[PDB]
mmCIF file of C-alpha atoms and ligand atoms in Angstrom:
data_model
loop_
_atom_site.group_PDB
_atom_site.id
_atom_site.type_symbol
_atom_site.label_atom_id
_atom_site.label_comp_id
_atom_site.label_asym_id
_atom_site.label_seq_id
_atom_site.Cartn_x
_atom_site.Cartn_y
_atom_site.Cartn_z
ATOM 1 C CA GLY A 1 0.000 0.000 0.000
ATOM 2 C CA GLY A 2 2.967 2.331 0.206
ATOM 3 C CA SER A 3 3.299 4.931 2.924
ATOM 4 C CA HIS A 4 0.756 7.390 4.297
ATOM 5 C CA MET A 5 2.854 10.122 5.845
ATOM 6 C CA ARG A 6 1.097 13.074 7.416
ATOM 7 C CA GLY A 7 2.410 15.941 9.459
ATOM 8 C CA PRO A 8 5.807 17.391 10.260
ATOM 9 C CA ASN A 9 8.820 15.272 11.054
ATOM 10 C CA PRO A 10 8.564 13.930 14.614
ATOM 11 C CA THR A 11 10.867 14.744 17.495
ATOM 12 C CA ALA A 12 10.852 13.402 21.045
ATOM 13 C CA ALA A 13 9.487 16.710 22.344
ATOM 14 C CA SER A 14 6.742 16.893 19.705
ATOM 15 C CA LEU A 15 5.585 13.380 20.589
ATOM 16 C CA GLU A 16 5.736 13.980 24.355
ATOM 17 C CA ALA A 17 3.609 17.116 24.134
ATOM 18 C CA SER A 18 -0.055 16.645 24.950
ATOM 19 C CA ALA A 19 -1.163 18.339 21.703
ATOM 20 C CA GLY A 20 0.024 17.084 18.334
ATOM 21 C CA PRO A 21 0.332 19.138 15.140
ATOM 22 C CA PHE A 22 -3.288 18.998 13.930
ATOM 23 C CA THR A 23 -6.349 20.788 15.249
ATOM 24 C CA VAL A 24 -8.942 18.361 16.616
ATOM 25 C CA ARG A 25 -12.710 18.512 16.728
ATOM 26 C CA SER A 26 -15.152 15.896 17.951
ATOM 27 C CA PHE A 27 -18.743 14.800 17.777
ATOM 28 C CA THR A 28 -20.880 12.164 19.468
ATOM 29 C CA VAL A 29 -22.328 9.427 17.262
ATOM 30 C CA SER A 30 -26.067 10.037 16.930
ATOM 31 C CA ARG A 31 -27.184 6.422 16.295
ATOM 32 C CA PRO A 32 -24.403 4.047 17.383
ATOM 33 C CA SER A 33 -24.698 0.702 15.611
ATOM 34 C CA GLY A 34 -23.516 -2.324 17.565
ATOM 35 C CA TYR A 35 -22.095 -0.588 20.634
ATOM 36 C CA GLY A 36 -23.333 1.719 23.377
ATOM 37 C CA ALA A 37 -22.104 5.195 22.482
ATOM 38 C CA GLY A 38 -19.109 6.871 20.879
ATOM 39 C CA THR A 39 -17.186 10.105 20.647
ATOM 40 C CA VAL A 40 -15.324 10.606 17.355
ATOM 41 C CA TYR A 41 -12.153 12.730 17.375
ATOM 42 C CA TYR A 42 -10.761 13.839 14.046
ATOM 43 C CA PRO A 43 -8.136 16.214 12.678
ATOM 44 C CA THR A 44 -9.581 19.099 10.750
ATOM 45 C CA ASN A 45 -6.369 19.733 8.788
ATOM 46 C CA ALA A 46 -4.450 16.493 8.248
ATOM 47 C CA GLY A 47 -3.700 17.049 4.572
ATOM 48 C CA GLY A 48 -4.945 13.634 3.468
ATOM 49 C CA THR A 49 -7.038 10.713 4.598
ATOM 50 C CA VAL A 50 -6.033 9.098 7.874
ATOM 51 C CA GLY A 51 -6.488 5.754 9.543
ATOM 52 C CA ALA A 52 -9.086 4.981 12.180
ATOM 53 C CA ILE A 53 -8.671 3.648 15.725
ATOM 54 C CA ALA A 54 -11.377 2.322 18.053
ATOM 55 C CA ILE A 55 -10.743 2.351 21.821
ATOM 56 C CA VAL A 56 -12.692 0.335 24.436
ATOM 57 C CA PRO A 57 -12.772 0.868 28.232
ATOM 58 C CA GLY A 58 -12.592 -1.700 30.997
ATOM 59 C CA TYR A 59 -15.195 -3.528 33.080
ATOM 60 C CA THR A 60 -17.577 -1.115 34.865
ATOM 61 C CA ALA A 61 -15.798 1.810 33.172
ATOM 62 C CA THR A 62 -16.919 4.425 30.652
ATOM 63 C CA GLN A 63 -15.353 6.663 28.032
ATOM 64 C CA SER A 64 -13.898 8.934 30.738
ATOM 65 C CA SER A 65 -11.175 6.368 31.470
ATOM 66 C CA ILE A 66 -9.916 6.377 27.843
ATOM 67 C CA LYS A 67 -10.907 9.903 26.734
ATOM 68 C CA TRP A 68 -7.395 11.329 26.772
ATOM 69 C CA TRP A 69 -6.377 9.107 23.854
ATOM 70 C CA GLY A 70 -8.944 10.738 21.575
ATOM 71 C CA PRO A 71 -7.314 14.154 21.187
ATOM 72 C CA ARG A 72 -3.832 12.737 21.828
ATOM 73 C CA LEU A 73 -3.967 10.407 18.804
ATOM 74 C CA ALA A 74 -6.309 12.452 16.575
ATOM 75 C CA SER A 75 -4.008 15.494 16.793
ATOM 76 C CA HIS A 76 -1.281 13.423 15.074
ATOM 77 C CA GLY A 77 -3.532 12.370 12.176
ATOM 78 C CA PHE A 78 -6.071 9.677 13.067
ATOM 79 C CA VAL A 79 -9.848 9.385 13.333
ATOM 80 C CA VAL A 80 -10.358 7.962 16.837
ATOM 81 C CA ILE A 81 -13.584 6.612 18.353
ATOM 82 C CA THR A 82 -13.792 6.053 22.104
ATOM 83 C CA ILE A 83 -16.778 3.884 22.912
ATOM 84 C CA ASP A 84 -19.053 2.975 25.722
ATOM 85 C CA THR A 85 -20.152 -0.633 25.634
ATOM 86 C CA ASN A 86 -23.782 -1.718 25.514
ATOM 87 C CA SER A 87 -23.403 -2.572 29.203
ATOM 88 C CA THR A 88 -20.441 -1.641 31.368
ATOM 89 C CA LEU A 89 -20.478 -5.292 32.492
ATOM 90 C CA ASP A 90 -19.781 -6.729 28.997
ATOM 91 C CA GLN A 91 -17.004 -9.338 28.761
ATOM 92 C CA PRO A 92 -13.999 -9.285 26.390
ATOM 93 C CA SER A 93 -15.517 -11.152 23.422
ATOM 94 C CA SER A 94 -18.470 -8.765 23.441
ATOM 95 C CA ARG A 95 -16.093 -5.812 23.751
ATOM 96 C CA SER A 96 -14.210 -7.029 20.667
ATOM 97 C CA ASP A 97 -17.439 -7.268 18.660
ATOM 98 C CA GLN A 98 -18.402 -3.727 19.721
ATOM 99 C CA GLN A 99 -14.916 -2.452 18.875
ATOM 100 C CA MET A 100 -15.135 -3.863 15.377
ATOM 101 C CA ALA A 101 -18.680 -2.469 15.028
ATOM 102 C CA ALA A 102 -17.366 0.972 15.927
ATOM 103 C CA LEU A 103 -14.660 0.737 13.253
ATOM 104 C CA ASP A 104 -17.350 -0.300 10.771
ATOM 105 C CA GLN A 105 -19.419 2.716 11.717
ATOM 106 C CA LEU A 106 -16.414 4.975 11.120
ATOM 107 C CA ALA A 107 -16.189 3.421 7.659
ATOM 108 C CA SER A 108 -19.894 4.128 7.092
ATOM 109 C CA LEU A 109 -19.625 7.726 8.284
ATOM 110 C CA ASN A 110 -16.727 8.163 5.873
ATOM 111 C CA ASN A 111 -19.341 7.443 3.150
ATOM 112 C CA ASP A 112 -21.852 9.922 4.655
ATOM 113 C CA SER A 113 -21.784 13.382 3.077
ATOM 114 C CA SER A 114 -23.446 14.851 6.174
ATOM 115 C CA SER A 115 -20.786 13.643 8.583
ATOM 116 C CA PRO A 116 -17.807 15.706 9.728
ATOM 117 C CA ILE A 117 -15.544 12.798 8.670
ATOM 118 C CA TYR A 118 -16.940 12.361 5.146
ATOM 119 C CA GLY A 119 -13.973 11.355 3.042
ATOM 120 C CA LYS A 120 -11.505 11.793 5.900
ATOM 121 C CA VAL A 121 -10.873 8.080 6.604
ATOM 122 C CA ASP A 122 -8.722 5.545 4.787
ATOM 123 C CA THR A 123 -10.854 2.611 5.889
ATOM 124 C CA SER A 124 -8.183 0.095 4.848
ATOM 125 C CA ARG A 125 -5.978 1.292 7.748
ATOM 126 C CA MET A 126 -7.436 0.540 11.164
ATOM 127 C CA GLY A 127 -6.229 -0.079 14.675
ATOM 128 C CA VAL A 128 -7.575 -1.218 18.047
ATOM 129 C CA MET A 129 -6.812 -0.164 21.652
ATOM 130 C CA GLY A 130 -8.442 -0.679 25.002
ATOM 131 C CA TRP A 131 -7.993 -0.916 28.735
ATOM 132 C CA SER A 132 -8.389 -4.003 30.914
ATOM 133 C CA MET A 133 -11.221 -6.132 29.495
ATOM 134 C CA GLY A 134 -11.104 -3.729 26.566
ATOM 135 C CA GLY A 135 -7.459 -4.586 26.119
ATOM 136 C CA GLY A 136 -8.400 -8.256 26.160
ATOM 137 C CA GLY A 137 -11.019 -7.391 23.558
ATOM 138 C CA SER A 138 -8.402 -5.581 21.482
ATOM 139 C CA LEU A 139 -6.303 -8.757 21.409
ATOM 140 C CA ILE A 140 -9.380 -10.754 20.356
ATOM 141 C CA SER A 141 -10.053 -8.196 17.641
ATOM 142 C CA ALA A 142 -6.497 -8.486 16.350
ATOM 143 C CA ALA A 143 -6.585 -12.289 16.371
ATOM 144 C CA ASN A 144 -9.914 -12.376 14.527
ATOM 145 C CA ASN A 145 -9.089 -9.545 12.077
ATOM 146 C CA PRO A 146 -5.517 -9.774 10.767
ATOM 147 C CA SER A 147 -6.213 -6.955 8.316
ATOM 148 C CA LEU A 148 -5.934 -4.542 11.249
ATOM 149 C CA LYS A 149 -2.664 -2.563 11.046
ATOM 150 C CA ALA A 150 -1.923 -2.120 14.766
ATOM 151 C CA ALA A 151 -3.092 -2.903 18.284
ATOM 152 C CA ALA A 152 -2.287 -1.373 21.669
ATOM 153 C CA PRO A 153 -3.851 -3.130 24.654
ATOM 154 C CA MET A 154 -3.391 -1.368 28.005
ATOM 155 C CA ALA A 155 -3.246 -3.349 31.269
ATOM 156 C CA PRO A 156 -5.071 -6.120 29.431
ATOM 157 C CA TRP A 157 -7.267 -8.582 31.301
ATOM 158 C CA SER A 158 -7.989 -11.927 29.648
ATOM 159 C CA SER A 159 -9.061 -15.391 30.771
ATOM 160 C CA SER A 160 -6.766 -16.925 28.128
ATOM 161 C CA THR A 161 -3.214 -15.778 27.473
ATOM 162 C CA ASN A 162 -2.656 -17.607 24.161
ATOM 163 C CA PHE A 163 -2.639 -15.053 21.337
ATOM 164 C CA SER A 164 -0.098 -16.967 19.272
ATOM 165 C CA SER A 165 -2.174 -16.460 16.119
ATOM 166 C CA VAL A 166 -1.817 -12.633 16.148
ATOM 167 C CA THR A 167 0.038 -11.162 13.167
ATOM 168 C CA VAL A 168 -0.921 -7.523 13.892
ATOM 169 C CA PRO A 169 1.844 -5.227 15.333
ATOM 170 C CA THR A 170 0.949 -5.151 19.030
ATOM 171 C CA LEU A 171 2.176 -2.818 21.780
ATOM 172 C CA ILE A 172 1.171 -3.982 25.268
ATOM 173 C CA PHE A 173 1.241 -1.370 28.019
ATOM 174 C CA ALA A 174 1.506 -3.010 31.450
ATOM 175 C CA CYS A 175 1.336 -1.594 34.963
ATOM 176 C CA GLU A 176 3.976 -2.928 37.325
ATOM 177 C CA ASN A 177 1.864 -3.192 40.474
ATOM 178 C CA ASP A 178 -1.393 -4.178 38.795
ATOM 179 C CA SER A 179 -3.540 -6.163 41.208
ATOM 180 C CA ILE A 180 -6.618 -6.453 38.937
ATOM 181 C CA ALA A 181 -4.848 -7.863 35.850
ATOM 182 C CA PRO A 182 -1.503 -8.901 37.367
ATOM 183 C CA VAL A 183 1.320 -8.667 34.851
ATOM 184 C CA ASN A 184 2.574 -12.186 35.595
ATOM 185 C CA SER A 185 -0.762 -13.841 34.729
ATOM 186 C CA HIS A 186 -2.055 -11.432 32.059
ATOM 187 C CA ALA A 187 0.046 -8.897 30.138
ATOM 188 C CA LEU A 188 3.345 -10.777 30.214
ATOM 189 C CA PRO A 189 2.162 -14.291 29.208
ATOM 190 C CA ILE A 190 0.010 -12.643 26.539
ATOM 191 C CA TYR A 191 3.092 -10.809 25.243
ATOM 192 C CA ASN A 192 5.227 -13.954 25.276
ATOM 193 C CA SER A 193 2.590 -15.949 23.382
ATOM 194 C CA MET A 194 2.925 -13.856 20.210
ATOM 195 C CA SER A 195 5.651 -15.248 17.863
ATOM 196 C CA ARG A 196 4.209 -14.070 14.553
ATOM 197 C CA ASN A 197 4.312 -10.279 14.819
ATOM 198 C CA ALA A 198 6.139 -7.104 15.613
ATOM 199 C CA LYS A 199 5.449 -6.534 19.280
ATOM 200 C CA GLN A 200 6.475 -4.460 22.263
ATOM 201 C CA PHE A 201 5.952 -4.607 26.031
ATOM 202 C CA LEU A 202 6.138 -1.416 28.107
ATOM 203 C CA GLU A 203 5.619 -1.887 31.851
ATOM 204 C CA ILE A 204 5.059 1.345 33.779
ATOM 205 C CA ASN A 205 7.077 1.533 36.968
ATOM 206 C CA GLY A 206 4.984 1.730 40.108
ATOM 207 C CA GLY A 207 1.796 1.641 38.067
ATOM 208 C CA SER A 208 -1.625 0.623 39.304
ATOM 209 C CA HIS A 209 -4.217 -0.925 36.975
ATOM 210 C CA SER A 210 -5.209 2.586 35.798
ATOM 211 C CA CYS A 211 -1.642 3.620 34.837
ATOM 212 C CA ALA A 212 -2.497 4.325 31.172
ATOM 213 C CA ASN A 213 -5.893 5.925 31.784
ATOM 214 C CA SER A 214 -7.018 9.535 31.625
ATOM 215 C CA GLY A 215 -5.163 11.598 34.171
ATOM 216 C CA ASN A 216 -2.184 9.250 34.454
ATOM 217 C CA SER A 217 1.180 10.644 35.477
ATOM 218 C CA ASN A 218 3.071 9.411 32.423
ATOM 219 C CA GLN A 219 1.121 10.834 29.516
ATOM 220 C CA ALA A 220 4.312 12.143 27.896
ATOM 221 C CA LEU A 221 5.912 8.699 27.630
ATOM 222 C CA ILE A 222 2.747 6.621 27.131
ATOM 223 C CA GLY A 223 1.362 9.052 24.572
ATOM 224 C CA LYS A 224 4.682 9.235 22.727
ATOM 225 C CA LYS A 225 4.824 5.455 22.465
ATOM 226 C CA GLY A 226 1.174 5.018 21.493
ATOM 227 C CA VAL A 227 1.358 7.675 18.799
ATOM 228 C CA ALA A 228 4.729 6.449 17.514
ATOM 229 C CA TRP A 229 3.479 2.857 17.298
ATOM 230 C CA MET A 230 0.277 3.808 15.487
ATOM 231 C CA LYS A 231 2.101 6.142 13.097
ATOM 232 C CA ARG A 232 4.768 3.566 12.272
ATOM 233 C CA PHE A 233 2.385 0.655 11.673
ATOM 234 C CA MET A 234 -0.876 2.257 10.542
ATOM 235 C CA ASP A 235 0.849 4.760 8.252
ATOM 236 C CA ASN A 236 3.886 2.689 7.224
ATOM 237 C CA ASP A 237 5.834 5.799 8.238
ATOM 238 C CA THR A 238 9.467 4.938 8.930
ATOM 239 C CA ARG A 239 10.119 8.420 10.251
ATOM 240 C CA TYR A 240 8.623 6.821 13.376
ATOM 241 C CA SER A 241 10.672 3.609 13.357
ATOM 242 C CA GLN A 242 13.117 4.751 16.014
ATOM 243 C CA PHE A 243 10.405 6.147 18.295
ATOM 244 C CA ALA A 244 8.308 3.009 17.881
ATOM 245 C CA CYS A 245 11.118 0.508 18.396
ATOM 246 C CA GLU A 246 13.420 2.167 20.908
ATOM 247 C CA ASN A 247 13.821 1.414 24.548
ATOM 248 C CA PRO A 248 12.679 4.805 25.923
ATOM 249 C CA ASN A 249 15.479 4.843 28.506
ATOM 250 C CA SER A 250 12.963 6.026 31.088
ATOM 251 C CA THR A 251 13.086 5.558 34.846
ATOM 252 C CA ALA A 252 9.302 5.472 34.426
ATOM 253 C CA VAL A 253 9.624 2.049 32.721
ATOM 254 C CA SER A 254 10.219 -0.991 34.914
ATOM 255 C CA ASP A 255 10.317 -3.571 32.084
ATOM 256 C CA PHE A 256 10.798 -3.067 28.348
ATOM 257 C CA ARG A 257 10.768 -5.776 25.660
ATOM 258 C CA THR A 258 10.368 -5.658 21.902
ATOM 259 C CA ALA A 259 10.585 -8.101 19.006
ATOM 260 C CA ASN A 260 10.689 -7.880 15.201
ATOM 261 C CA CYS A 261 10.371 -4.096 15.289
ATOM 262 C CA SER A 262 11.535 -1.931 12.389
HETATM 263 CA CA1 CA B 301 9.402 -0.704 40.485
#
């Protein structure tokens, strides 16, 4: 598909800032199809079509826990939907279905001349993210939909750790002191199961289960890595290779691993 480069050349400082290069606006989805609710964040001035990312919260949680990713990613050139699930008690498989339904709705709104994102989406370039059970659902989405270009589960919770089938580039954020989805029985065995993909594991030092959520104390680092990963793999943009693949050399990181990254 070639590359899909948007925006000025990245620097560490420009990726650690809270606001990327593009102005962002948002709207709530009027008739969500297959999920509970969504807010769509989009760049007004990206200079070309951009890929789409759907983000799912955790069990009992709402969009507030994942909201910060909307403007953070959209401002670098992505259409991002943060969803609420049909019920906040939905399990990971249901969360995956709703995540994929939200991406499909972004593709439909791209066809809709009355939508703010009419013609703004390259619907062939999509990614998945989520927290906790939504991170589990993101891994299910990636396993079931290898056409996805990237995945970034955060403090994932899953009953099964075997994601050996996944071929999608996957960045797993983990939280060192997680007591809800302990790293040793969730994020790390999940990470080790994947032998068929580019992958990365970033464990946040001292982090509780909410360490990648809105209001976290490491938005510079986490946001830099999330954006860099999505830019590298959703846009095929090798200006981001070093940022996506590098050990961040951060006292904020207690464990860093990566494989097959370029
Ligand atoms: Ca520590």
